[PDB]
Design an enzyme around this catalytic site. Structure first.
Site, PDB file in Angstrom:
ATOM      1  N   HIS A  80      11.719  58.705  72.514  1.00  0.00           N
ATOM      2  CA  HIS A  80      11.052  59.548  72.366  1.00  0.00           C
ATOM      3  C   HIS A  80      10.578  60.598  73.302  1.00  0.00           C
ATOM      4  O   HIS A  80       9.636  60.819  73.710  1.00  0.00           O
ATOM      5  CB  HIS A  80       9.799  58.684  71.897  1.00  0.00           C
ATOM      6  N   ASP A 121       6.800  64.817  68.288  1.00  0.00           N
ATOM      7  CA  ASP A 121       7.014  64.164  69.160  1.00  0.00           C
ATOM      8  C   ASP A 121       6.171  64.666  70.452  1.00  0.00           C
ATOM      9  O   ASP A 121       6.177  63.555  71.544  1.00  0.00           O
ATOM     10  CB  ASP A 121       8.451  63.197  69.203  1.00  0.00           C
ATOM     11  N   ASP A 232      13.593  63.606  60.990  1.00  0.00           N
ATOM     12  CA  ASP A 232      13.467  63.264  61.781  1.00  0.00           C
ATOM     13  C   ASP A 232      13.926  61.229  62.283  1.00  0.00           C
ATOM     14  O   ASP A 232      14.199  60.968  63.330  1.00  0.00           O
ATOM     15  CB  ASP A 232      11.511  62.364  61.848  1.00  0.00           C
TER      16      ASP A 232
HETATM   17  N1  LIG Z   1      13.855  50.102  62.154  1.00  0.00           N
HETATM   18  C1  LIG Z   1      14.173  51.103  62.850  1.00  0.00           C
HETATM   19  N2  LIG Z   1      13.262  51.719  62.874  1.00  0.00           N
HETATM   20  C2  LIG Z   1      13.417  53.505  63.073  1.00  0.00           C
HETATM   21  C3  LIG Z   1      14.416  53.795  63.623  1.00  0.00           C
HETATM   22  N3  LIG Z   1      14.850  54.915  63.215  1.00  0.00           N
HETATM   23  C4  LIG Z   1      13.199  55.112  63.161  1.00  0.00           C
HETATM   24  N4  LIG Z   1      12.450  54.271  63.493  1.00  0.00           N
HETATM   25  C5  LIG Z   1      10.768  54.484  62.228  1.00  0.00           C
HETATM   26  O1  LIG Z   1      10.814  55.915  62.011  1.00  0.00           O
HETATM   27  C6  LIG Z   1       9.481  55.850  62.657  1.00  0.00           C
HETATM   28  C7  LIG Z   1       9.787  57.418  63.291  1.00  0.00           C
HETATM   29  O2  LIG Z   1       9.046  58.347  64.321  1.00  0.00           O
HETATM   30  P1  LIG Z   1       9.552  58.002  65.562  1.00  0.00           P
HETATM   31  O3  LIG Z   1       9.503  57.196  66.245  1.00  0.00           O
HETATM   32  O4  LIG Z   1       9.984  59.397  65.809  1.00  0.00           O
HETATM   33  O5  LIG Z   1       7.774  58.739  66.683  1.00  0.00           O
HETATM   34  C8  LIG Z   1       9.384  55.014  63.942  1.00  0.00           C
HETATM   35  O6  LIG Z   1       8.367  55.007  64.513  1.00  0.00           O
HETATM   36  C9  LIG Z   1      10.012  53.948  63.305  1.00  0.00           C
HETATM   37  O7  LIG Z   1       8.896  53.037  62.342  1.00  0.00           O
HETATM   38  C10 LIG Z   1      15.397  52.928  63.477  1.00  0.00           C
HETATM   39  O8  LIG Z   1      16.471  53.412  63.839  1.00  0.00           O
HETATM   40  N5  LIG Z   1      14.947  51.496  63.088  1.00  0.00           N
HETATM   41 MG   LIG Z   2       6.657  61.001  65.954  1.00  0.00          MG
HETATM   42 ZN   LIG Z   3       9.916  61.711  65.556  1.00  0.00          ZN
END
Ligand SMILES: Nc1nc2c(ncn2[C@@H]2O[C@H](COP(=O)(O)O)[C@@H](O)[C@H]2O)c(=O)[nH]1
Ligand SMILES: [Mg+2]
Ligand SMILES: [Zn+2]
EC number: 3.1.4.35
Length: 326
Positions: A80, A121, A232
């Site tokens: 992030h 973020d 995202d």
């Molecule tokens: N298990 C998994 N979750 C992901 C992945 N990429 C994004 N996420 C899910 O989608 C959310 C996106 O929100 P961010 O992490 O950008 O704040 C993450 O917190 C997570 O729960 C990934 O590659 N694997």
């Molecule tokens: Mg986020």
């Molecule tokens: Zn994000």
């Protein structure tokens, strides 16, 4: 001054074309780019979406704002960080251009989406909403445990947009500015995955029944929410070497939180946060693709056939991860 030097150099640099920067490609990679190159890419995104000309943004002000945004992502967080935000904005740009989504939205909506993507973020601490709630974070108290991080991210976005020399929305009338901030806020809040899961059903049902209508304000807001989610999570659609690298960054943050949960909170972390399951990352990625990503990119494809490359990229990564899971 060091920060003054950084801004003067950025502001004086030529902004390379979108073509040269490869930002119109869904398969775009930021890995070989320097921080300065990502800032130039960002200027080009605003320019080619006609946001600079149409909203009378002073070049110096846009440059200062971009540097402020980049500076307000933490450098000790594996995933992030600024690169994630930057990649999210590039996917939005590619979706609007190559995905042909720009013709379905107004300039004000596009302005809000780009800003939101870049800011979505901001100042992320590298832990989840639930962790902040369970550790009595001041953020959890402030936002009553509701989309805690996302409210924090919008607050930071607002703080930067209002700071002297960074006001990229000064050219908007008061009515336009109120409207734009409302869209930005809803767009950042939409990146809370819990909210995507809650509302995705309505979006899918509208597409299934051929009742999708962007003139409806509720459905317009819904669509902007799904687009933000699509951007995202877009690392899941990237070429294999990029997705394998990014997935390890995501796991890094999750496993570190799990270690804190085990030690400070005395709870056995869930699989995704449990370092013991490192060998199961492939099965966990396939599980994430099946439960979340596949249907989202399928829905976006029905909305615009030129968004098919996102779905295609997602499917190819599921094949790659499943081969490692078996
Ligand atoms: N298990 C998994 N979750 C992901 C992945 N990429 C994004 N996420 C899910 O989608 C959310 C996106 O929100 P961010 O992490 O950008 O704040 C993450 O917190 C997570 O729960 C990934 O590659 N694997
Ligand atoms: Mg986020
Ligand atoms: Zn994000």
């Amino acid at each position: 001054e060091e920060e003054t030097r950084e801004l003067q150099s950025l502001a004086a640099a030529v902004v390379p074309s979108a073509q040269t920067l490869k930002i119109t490609d869904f398969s775009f990679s930021d890995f070989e780019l320097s921080d300065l190159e990502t800032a130039l890419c960002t200027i080009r995104m605003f320019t080619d979406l006609n946001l600079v000309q149409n909203f009378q943004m002073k070049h110096e002000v846009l440059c200062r704002w971009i540097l402020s945004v980049k500076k307000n992502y933490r450098k000790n967080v594996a995933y992030h960080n600024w690169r994630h935000a930057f990649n999210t904005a590039q996917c939005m740009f590619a979706a609007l251009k190559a995905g042909k989504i720009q013709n379905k939205l107004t300039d004000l909506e596009i302005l809000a989406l780009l800003i939101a993507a870049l800011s979505h973020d901001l100042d992320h601490p590298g832990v989840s909403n639930q962790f902040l709630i369970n550790t009595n974070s001041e953020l959890a108290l402030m936002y009553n445990d509701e989309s805690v991080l996302e409210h924090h991210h919008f607050d930071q976005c607002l703080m930067i947009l209002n700071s002297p020399g960074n006001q990229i929305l000064s050219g908007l009338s008061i009515e336009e500015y109120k409207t734009t901030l409302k869209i930005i806020k809803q767009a950042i809040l939409a990146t809370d995955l819990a909210l995507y899961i809650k509302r995705r059903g309505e979006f899918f049902e509208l597409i299934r029944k051929n009742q999708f209508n962007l003139e409806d304000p509720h459905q317009k807001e819904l669509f902007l929410a799904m687009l933000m989610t699509a951007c995202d999570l877009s690392a899941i659609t990237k070429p294999w070497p990029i997705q394998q690298r990014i997935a390890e960054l995501v796991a890094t943050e999750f496993f570190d939180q799990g270690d804190r949960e085990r030690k400070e909170l005395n709870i056995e972390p869930t699989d995704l946060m449990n370092r013991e399951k490192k060998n199961k990352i492939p099965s966990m990625q396939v599980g994430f693709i099946d439960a979340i990503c596949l249907q989202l990119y399928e829905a976006l494809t029905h909305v615009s056939e030129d968004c098919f490359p996102l779905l295609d990229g997602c499917r190819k990564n599921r094949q790659k991860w499943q081969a490692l899971a078996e």
